[PDB]
Nucleic acid binder design. Structure first.
Ligand SMILES: Cc1cn([C@H]2C[C@H](O)[C@@](C)(COP(=O)(O)OP(=O)(O)OP(=O)(O)O)O2)c(=O)[nH]c1=O
Ligand SMILES: [Mg+2]
Ligand SMILES: [Mg+2]
Length: 539
DNA sequence: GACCACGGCGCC
DNA sequence: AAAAGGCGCCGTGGTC
């Protein structure tokens, strides 16, 4: 490639080097561009940003986020990572994509710009004729990256002072619990080390080991094991409570406050677009898709996520969505009827599990029932199921058989999906997003059957994810015009931020965009709440 | 100071 | 732990 003075012609491909992986926190070390056998290197990266109309190339969204941070409206365009991910979702890094489609991910901006141009040419080649994947790239992924760049640059407000104070309280509680554990053990040890804890529990206290760890075959001290040992010794309960508190403290309460960005005063995650095997997004640095919600302390942490002053959060969450998707994909009449009658399978299982009326079921019960409903659907064993409901194995088995006989066509769809996956080497969502599952023909049963569970889950989970992505693409422009903001996506949920005066109107509109994203054989319903914090907005 | 594998566990 | 699927981050232990 011939050297050429900055700036590049229009439609050139950018390369850029960051001091670190997080766009919002990174120094832009270099910027380059390449077009028609040329490479232009920017003498000064930051100012050189101003000369671009579009971030076009590998990891375009990241450079776009960094541009937004500097007050520049530089939207992301074509990105070869998105083409590769669509061809095969195991294409998740530029290191791999480069090696696979004609180059090498280096640490120099010019070489990255050139790699972007080459990779785009080649990958675009692979996608000619793949009309459904092309529809996904133009109508969903490429536009979605623009939406994601904005969400990343916006961030969410956090109640820092509140978390600081909460930390001090939980610290004292943790001290009480570890002091108890050591007294019962008859000596101190690192309660954080599951190796040391294993020795205390199963060698010194001589408790019955229940399970082994996967890789190294040690005696497990997992929550499930400890739960089966609640009655066997007083120390077990204290260890479980200790685990809850230190998990929440070390993962959320302590780290989060230190991640408030100086410029924005807000908390910024990354929304990874080519990270999962099913087509879902992931979130990292920090992960804001796994903020606690289940337990009392978890809920207090969720309360820390608040709206800007004079604004409200709007939380919208698809109802029983993967079950609705499954009704459509499978064509099961009984299942479709359930949704056309406005029934609620999670609530129905909850009232059965806890032997209470439908009206007596609370949120924690329903959430319990959800892990049961999806667990069983995607292949949970009778033994495990019996352990979690704490019912006899025989009853666990009856639950699973009635579950599937209640919806006859589901098992048929599964078998059809696996057969097709064996012939073609891949399975696909409603929109033709693919996941290759070669192990469908493994000669080892356990490997083969693990692959089968991955294979028939993918169309379901991936269609739900397709729907949300499309809903976000349709929704974003409508929010901009109303002066509202899109903050987070948590798979089948969206968290927005609206001026108080317009929160109500924004909520109704978002609900309708999401419900009408793409009509199915069953209605899509969206539960929506409004509130000053994330907890309040979900009900 | 940085890797990693591992067990473990938070959420969807 | 166990035939649920999909993620990312924690501390420990071990290494470089
Ligand atoms: C808890 C859980 C979730 N999911 C999946 C399957 C599911 O449809 C979703 C897309 C969203 O989760 P959700 O909103 O909590 O639940 P629903 O949408 O089904 O119902 P509502 O409460 O919203 O009415 O992730 C699992 O695969 N395993 C799990 O343990
Ligand atoms: Mg939902
Ligand atoms: Mg949800």
């Amino acid at each position: 490639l011939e050297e050429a003075p900055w700036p590049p012609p229009e439609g050139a491909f950018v390369g850029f080097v960051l001091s670190r992986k997080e766009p919002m926190w990174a120094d832009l070390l270099a910027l380059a561009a390449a077009r028609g056998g040329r490479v232009h290197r920017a003498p000064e990266p930051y100012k050189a940003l101003r000369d671009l109309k579009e971030a076009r190339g590998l990891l375009a969204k990241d450079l776009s986020v960094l541009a937004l941070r500097e007050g520049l409206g530089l939207p992301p365009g074509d990105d070869p990572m998105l083409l590769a991910y669509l061809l095969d979702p195991s294409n998740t890094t530029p290191e791999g994509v480069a090696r696979r489609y004609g180059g090498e991910w280096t640490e120099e901006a010019g070489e990255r710009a050139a790699l972007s141009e080459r990779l785009f040419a080649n990958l675009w080649g692979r996608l000619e004729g793949e009309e459904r994947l092309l529809w996904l790239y133009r109508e969903v992924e490429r536009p979605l990256s623009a939406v994601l760049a904005h969400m990343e640059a916006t961030g969410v407000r956090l109640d820092v002072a509140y978390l600081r104070a909460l930390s001090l309280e939980v610290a004292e509680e943790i001290a009480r619990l570890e002091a108890e554990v050591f007294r019962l053990a008859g000596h101190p040890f690192n309660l954080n080390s599951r190796d040391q804890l294993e020795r205390v529990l199963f060698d010194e206290l001589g408790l019955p080991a229940i399970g082994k760890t996967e890789k190294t075959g040690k005696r497990s001290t997992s929550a499930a094991v400890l739960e089966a040992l609640r009655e066997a010794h007083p120390i077990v309960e204290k260890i479980l409570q200790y685990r809850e508190l230190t998990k929440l403290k070390s993962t959320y309460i302590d780290p989060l406050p230190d991640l408030i960005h100086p410029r924005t005063g807000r908390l910024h995650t990354r929304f990874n677009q080519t990270a999962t095997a099913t087509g879902r997004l992931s979130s990292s640095d920090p992960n804001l898709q796994n903020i606690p919600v289940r337990t009392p302390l978890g809920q207090r942490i969720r309360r820390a996520f608040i709206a800007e002053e004079g604004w409200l959060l709007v939380a919208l969450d698809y109802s029983q969505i993967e079950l609705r998707v499954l009704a459509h994909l499978s064509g099961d009449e009984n299942l479709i009827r359930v949704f056309q009658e406005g029934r609620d399978i999670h609530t129905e299982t909850a009232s059965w599990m806890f032997g209470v009326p439908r009206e007596a079921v609370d949120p924690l019960m329903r959430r319990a029932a959800k892990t049961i409903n999806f667990g069983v659907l995607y292949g949970m064993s009778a033994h495990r199921l019996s352990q979690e409901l704490a019912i006899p194995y025989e009853e666990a088995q009856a639950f699973i058989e009635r579950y599937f006989q209640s919806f006859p066509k589901v098992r048929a769809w599964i078998e059809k999906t696996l057969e097709e996956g064996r012939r073609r080497g891949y399975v696909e969502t409603l929109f033709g997003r693919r996941r290759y599952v070669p192990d469908l023909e493994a000669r080892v049963k356990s490997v083969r059957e693990a692959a089968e569970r991955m294979a028939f889950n993918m169309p379901v989970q991936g269609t739900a994810a397709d729907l949300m992505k499309l809903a976000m693409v349709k929704l974003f422009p409508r929010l901009e015009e109303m002066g509202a903001r899109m903050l987070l996506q948590v798979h089948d949920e969206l968290v927005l931020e609206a001026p108080k005066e317009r929160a109500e109107a924004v909520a109704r509109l978002a609900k309708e965009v999401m419900e009408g994203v793409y009509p199915l054989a069953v209605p899509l319903e969206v539960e929506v709440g409004i509130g000053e914090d994330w907890l309040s907005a979900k009900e």
